[PDB]
Amino acid sequence: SEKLTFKTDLEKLEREKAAQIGVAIVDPQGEIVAGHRMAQRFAMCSTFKFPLAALVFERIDSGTERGDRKLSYGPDMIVEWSPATERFLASGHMTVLEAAQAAVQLSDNGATNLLLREIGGPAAMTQYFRKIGDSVSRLDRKEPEMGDNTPGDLRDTTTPIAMARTVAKVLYGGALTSTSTHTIERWLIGNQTGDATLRAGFPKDWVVGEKTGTCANGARNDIGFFKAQERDYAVAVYTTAPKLSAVERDELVASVGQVITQLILS
């Protein structure tokens, strides 16, 4: 069967590429379409920045945050991979929207940390997960150390199913206004970091938006949505491949995308 080909192909990739592959695909109402290691814990890496943006938009939506509010910072705010933050340093600030846009589309760590500072840190980000029905996802640390991905550590982890359901909740389950849901979706579509990952393995006809992650011990992740045959899906892929090169990890997630494609199109 179609479902058996999905399973077998993912395992074939796990053995050949020395990898753990976590996959969850849900429909708009959170119901399971397909999975693999779906309740296994993986490090979030940068994938959480998409939910971070949801939290921010919910505060804008409610009137408890302002999109053009200036977030001030000095050089101490700069950490590894902070390309937007470095550029705006001289000027002395980024706005709420600037920083969230940097976080989502460039995976900018400094901009993520700037927002976390403003919204109440890892604990607030975690309670946002809980408030929207995710009892699994947890942010414990700031970037970049939240991506240490230490053996056995439960900090800064999710599961594929918990994150796919969170994605469905943010985009299709009314957690945000229509205008805020639309902005986040465009940002996810215009993401600058995911060209060689999941969307590389989806057909060119699919509308896909996603948020990547890369962190220690060969973590390569991608979460988001696709519209296929005019149906909407939420997908979360988490993988660990410590033996693989940079490029091969990308190709691994994109290969998972092709396995997904065949299951969906069948």
Side-chain angles (χ1 to χ4, degrees), residues 23-58:
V23 182
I25 299 167
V26 293
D27 74 5
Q29 304 95 226
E31 294 306 304
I32 289 167
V33 177
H36 198 91
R37 292 179 189 289
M38 74 161 47
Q40 194 168 311
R41 292 270 185 175
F42 294 81
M44 280 185 295
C45 309
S46 292
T47 57
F48 81 87
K49 292 166 188 185
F50 158 28
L52 178 57
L55 172 163
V56 167
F57 273 117
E58 188 229 66

XYZ file of all heavy atoms in Angstrom, residues 23-58:
276
model
N 8.427 12.778 11.269
C 7.437 13.391 10.373
C 6.026 13.346 10.940
O 5.566 12.304 11.407
C 7.334 12.672 9.003
C 6.320 13.390 8.118
C 8.683 12.595 8.300
N 5.319 14.463 10.819
C 3.895 14.514 11.138
C 3.216 15.384 10.098
O 3.729 16.468 9.757
C 3.683 15.083 12.541
N 2.099 14.901 9.557
C 1.282 15.672 8.623
C -0.136 15.607 9.148
O -0.670 14.519 9.390
C 1.278 15.107 7.189
C 2.686 15.078 6.572
C 0.378 15.957 6.305
C 2.768 14.256 5.294
N -0.752 16.772 9.283
C -2.097 16.852 9.763
C -2.929 17.696 8.823
O -2.412 18.515 8.040
C -2.156 17.408 11.213
C -1.507 16.412 12.176
C -1.531 18.792 11.301
N -4.236 17.472 8.889
C -5.182 18.297 8.168
C -5.505 19.526 9.019
O -4.986 19.644 10.143
C -6.409 17.458 7.771
C -7.351 17.141 8.929
O -7.210 17.587 10.092
O -8.298 16.426 8.621
N -6.315 20.470 8.479
C -6.518 21.720 9.180
C -7.066 21.597 10.599
O -6.889 22.513 11.402
C -7.517 22.450 8.279
C -7.190 21.949 6.920
C -6.951 20.495 7.154
N -7.701 20.467 10.900
C -8.332 20.236 12.182
C -7.447 19.366 13.093
O -7.872 18.935 14.165
C -9.713 19.597 11.948
C -10.645 20.413 11.030
C -10.625 19.990 9.552
O -10.547 20.835 8.638
N -10.728 18.688 9.306
N -6.217 19.107 12.658
C -5.217 18.487 13.506
C -5.205 16.977 13.427
O -4.457 16.315 14.151
N -6.016 16.417 12.532
C -6.149 14.974 12.438
C -4.954 14.446 11.663
O -4.446 15.132 10.785
C -7.450 14.570 11.747
C -8.704 14.937 12.542
C -8.675 14.400 13.965
O -8.509 13.176 14.152
O -8.780 15.214 14.902
N -4.545 13.223 11.976
C -3.327 12.623 11.402
C -3.491 12.129 9.953
O -4.328 11.285 9.662
C -2.850 11.436 12.245
C -2.272 11.909 13.589
C -1.785 10.642 11.495
C -2.075 10.768 14.568
N -2.666 12.656 9.056
C -2.644 12.210 7.664
C -1.552 11.168 7.459
O -1.761 10.206 6.740
C -2.423 13.384 6.688
C -2.333 12.892 5.248
C -3.556 14.399 6.822
N -0.392 11.402 8.080
C 0.778 10.537 7.970
C 1.776 10.870 9.080
O 1.877 12.022 9.508
C 1.439 10.700 6.609
N 2.522 9.861 9.533
C 3.608 10.081 10.491
C 4.701 9.022 10.468
O 4.590 8.030 9.769
N 5.754 9.298 11.233
C 6.966 8.479 11.394
C 7.680 9.064 12.593
O 7.848 10.288 12.673
C 7.876 8.502 10.148
C 8.875 7.352 10.116
N 8.609 6.178 9.518
C 10.146 7.227 10.666
C 9.643 5.347 9.680
N 10.590 5.986 10.384
N 8.040 8.238 13.568
C 8.598 8.726 14.829
C 7.838 9.961 15.316
O 8.426 10.908 15.811
C 10.079 9.049 14.652
C 10.934 7.813 14.411
C 12.391 8.207 14.222
N 13.214 7.089 13.794
C 13.553 6.047 14.559
N 13.154 5.947 15.836
N 14.299 5.086 14.035
N 6.516 9.954 15.171
C 5.774 11.206 15.307
C 5.641 11.715 16.749
O 5.387 12.895 16.951
C 4.411 11.084 14.656
C 3.418 10.254 15.445
S 1.722 10.580 14.962
C 1.832 10.526 13.177
N 5.818 10.837 17.733
C 5.778 11.234 19.148
C 7.151 11.105 19.800
O 7.276 11.168 21.013
C 4.745 10.413 19.915
N 8.188 10.991 18.978
C 9.568 11.075 19.421
C 10.043 12.522 19.588
O 9.686 13.414 18.807
C 10.443 10.336 18.392
C 11.843 10.016 18.821
C 12.503 9.056 17.857
O 11.930 8.050 17.506
N 13.716 9.365 17.437
N 10.847 12.755 20.626
C 11.344 14.086 20.930
C 12.540 14.445 20.035
O 13.470 13.658 19.886
C 11.775 14.194 22.411
C 10.644 14.123 23.427
C 10.091 15.505 23.718
N 9.093 15.481 24.774
C 8.514 16.557 25.290
N 8.835 17.788 24.851
N 7.615 16.407 26.260
N 12.494 15.640 19.437
C 13.617 16.209 18.671
C 13.812 17.653 19.107
O 12.866 18.340 19.562
C 13.330 16.249 17.157
C 13.193 14.904 16.489
C 11.998 14.187 16.563
C 14.215 14.388 15.732
C 11.856 12.976 15.907
C 14.087 13.180 15.080
C 12.901 12.463 15.171
N 15.026 18.145 18.945
C 15.312 19.515 19.292
C 14.565 20.414 18.312
O 14.537 20.151 17.112
C 16.814 19.772 19.237
N 13.958 21.477 18.812
C 13.268 22.404 17.919
C 14.202 23.099 16.963
O 13.840 23.304 15.811
C 12.460 23.446 18.688
C 11.136 22.884 19.166
S 10.115 24.123 19.948
C 11.128 24.501 21.381
N 15.411 23.416 17.430
C 16.302 24.366 16.730
C 15.488 25.634 16.425
O 14.598 25.991 17.198
C 16.949 23.787 15.444
S 17.797 22.190 15.548
N 15.771 26.303 15.314
C 15.072 27.530 14.954
C 13.574 27.398 14.584
O 12.897 28.419 14.318
C 15.821 28.206 13.809
O 17.078 28.680 14.262
N 13.032 26.180 14.583
C 11.648 26.015 14.143
C 10.669 26.799 14.994
O 9.615 27.141 14.494
C 11.155 24.551 14.078
O 11.301 23.943 15.351
C 11.851 23.756 12.990
N 11.028 27.101 16.252
C 10.137 27.735 17.227
C 9.848 29.232 16.918
O 8.936 29.855 17.516
C 10.725 27.601 18.660
C 11.795 28.606 18.993
C 11.477 29.863 19.516
C 13.141 28.295 18.799
C 12.479 30.797 19.797
C 14.135 29.210 19.108
C 13.802 30.468 19.611
N 10.643 29.789 16.019
C 10.608 31.210 15.717
C 9.319 31.532 14.962
O 8.862 32.678 14.952
C 11.860 31.617 14.931
C 13.169 31.548 15.737
C 14.409 31.615 14.861
C 15.708 31.362 15.631
N 16.955 31.543 14.831
N 8.740 30.506 14.326
C 7.484 30.666 13.633
C 6.378 30.805 14.687
O 5.665 31.790 14.650
C 7.303 29.561 12.576
C 5.883 29.289 12.165
C 4.887 30.269 12.213
C 5.549 28.023 11.684
C 3.603 29.981 11.819
C 4.251 27.735 11.281
C 3.282 28.716 11.347
N 6.261 29.869 15.637
C 5.399 30.109 16.809
C 5.662 31.422 17.595
O 4.733 32.019 18.102
C 5.690 28.899 17.693
C 5.924 27.818 16.718
C 6.601 28.441 15.523
N 6.916 31.842 17.708
C 7.269 33.105 18.373
C 6.547 34.256 17.694
O 5.962 35.088 18.373
C 8.795 33.349 18.362
C 9.284 34.665 18.999
C 8.838 34.824 20.447
C 10.788 34.774 18.916
N 6.565 34.244 16.358
C 5.892 35.218 15.521
C 4.389 35.151 15.713
O 3.753 36.180 15.706
C 6.238 35.007 14.052
N 3.836 33.947 15.864
C 2.405 33.795 16.180
C 2.086 34.472 17.504
O 1.115 35.255 17.601
C 1.979 32.325 16.214
N 2.911 34.211 18.520
C 2.676 34.832 19.824
C 2.621 36.366 19.668
O 1.660 36.995 20.093
C 3.729 34.350 20.839
C 3.911 34.907 22.262
C 4.723 33.896 23.045
C 4.626 36.253 22.303
N 3.624 36.941 19.004
C 3.696 38.395 18.765
C 2.460 38.919 18.026
O 1.856 39.906 18.434
C 4.963 38.767 17.958
C 4.879 40.194 17.452
C 6.223 38.554 18.792
N 2.082 38.257 16.947
C 0.913 38.667 16.206
C -0.340 38.597 17.072
O -1.208 39.454 16.964
C 0.748 37.866 14.906
C 1.489 38.461 13.747
C 2.518 37.778 13.117
C 1.143 39.719 13.277
C 3.191 38.345 12.044
C 1.804 40.290 12.217
C 2.833 39.606 11.595
N -0.427 37.617 17.958
C -1.589 37.542 18.865
C -1.646 38.766 19.790
O -2.732 39.219 20.144
C -1.544 36.267 19.700
C -2.788 36.003 20.529
C -2.453 35.668 21.963
O -1.938 36.564 22.667
O -2.723 34.524 22.403
